[PDB]
Symmetry: none
Subunit: 266 residues, 2 copies
Amino acid sequence: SIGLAHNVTILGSGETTVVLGHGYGTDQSVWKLLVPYLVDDYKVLLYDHMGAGTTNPDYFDFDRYSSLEGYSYDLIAILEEFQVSKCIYVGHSMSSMAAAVASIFRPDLFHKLVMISPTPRLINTEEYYGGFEQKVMDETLRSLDENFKSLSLGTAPLLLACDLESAAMQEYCRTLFNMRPDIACCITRMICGLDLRPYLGHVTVPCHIIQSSNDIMVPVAVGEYLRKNLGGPSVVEVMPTEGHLPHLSMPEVTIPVVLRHIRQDI
Amino acid sequence: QQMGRDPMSSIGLAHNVTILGSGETTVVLGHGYGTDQSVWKLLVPYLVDDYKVLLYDHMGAGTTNPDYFDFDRYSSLEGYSYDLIAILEEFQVSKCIYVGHSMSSMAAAVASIFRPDLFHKLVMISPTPRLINTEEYYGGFEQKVMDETLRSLDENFKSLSLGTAPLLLACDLESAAMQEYCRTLFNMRPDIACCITRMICGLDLRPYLGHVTVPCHIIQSSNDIMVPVAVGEYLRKNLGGPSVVEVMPTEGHLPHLSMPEVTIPVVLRHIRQDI
């Protein structure tokens, strides 16, 4: 069953459903501290996207999840299996961009998107600054299979902006290494090879863009690029945080920001 | 670049990098807490004929400029590992033999996790992954011994440091070892020294030991107040790669400085002979 495969959890009660989507390297447990502040006022649906260590590797289709739409379609199927419509989608990074792509196909299913650290593209052009020159990426992406443990341990402190003893880093690494490595390399390649710029103008759902002020994956200019190129209403809030996963590494600052954007409409 | 702070010029200058010898392989020497690269004075003549030797001071040592010490960066041990990675890359070093004392040996272990291409083996003098005992891991220090000793640290770095120096070194009061360790130890700026001390006492690297894969040679004193022999012997069963433990008939946490006649031949064998 769709619910089984994605470990779907539904909590709370409310006319509106808030749908929580974890990013790369984590699972739905990443929202442990946001969830108690939602249950009294909303229904909350949590799910694990395919390829997470909590999910069965034998439902991972390498061809399907080599493109982000594969996740968008899963999301559509899940929202349909549980009779959710015009939901509040809260997603971190890739998951927020996959929900945006899902909103293109079925805008009836989303009332607003809340995007924590989103980016439409990592690799620079002469046009657009995403934070990574192409041949740095090409060097990591062709080495990545040999690299994966050493590369993840080495960049995790800079990615999270956390120390090695931090609980956040240990927990991120714990879930990160519960993925089968071939699966993890597939998702990584897909994330790095992303160019969603042709589709931003076709997103029409309201978008709340929540970013870290210091995120090595997401230059602060990317948040404003999204706002000026999205087809519908949007708002950008740059938090005084560090790290690509501020909901995990600095929940004390991030959680009230996420809550305010969940609860207040553009 | 902040006005009144000395400009940083170069990785080599900033860490007082010294390169000696001639050799197809580079041996990289990393001093521990409270000293600098001169702690290796007596080992180095036995290496220069057969290896290149790179010596450097980690940041915060009294030999380095306080305006380059970043309190957030060296509040965690990886800050040193990244510095080590940067130095090795600035001097084009790869598959080196890293010889480090205690803290610096563990920073190199973490650097070898990040970039295993740069280390062929680690030679670790009195390493430990955690000082404070747990349920139940014996590192040598009850939690409130550390808690009281760390709240005493700012209260008076000098008295606590001089007071514990004889027990740390296991050396006599007139000894050269005591005079020299105390001299470099008191050349650290006290705020900087307290920062490093806190980082060392609060460290717990056991969750990462399984990711170390480079060969590790573990050399310790049989009577070290900072490192119960069970710790070296714990590292052996928990490191991810090949490892060897030699417990020397020495005393003291810095046996290379206080008992060179025993320690130097042991270090030489582990440098020159592979697992």
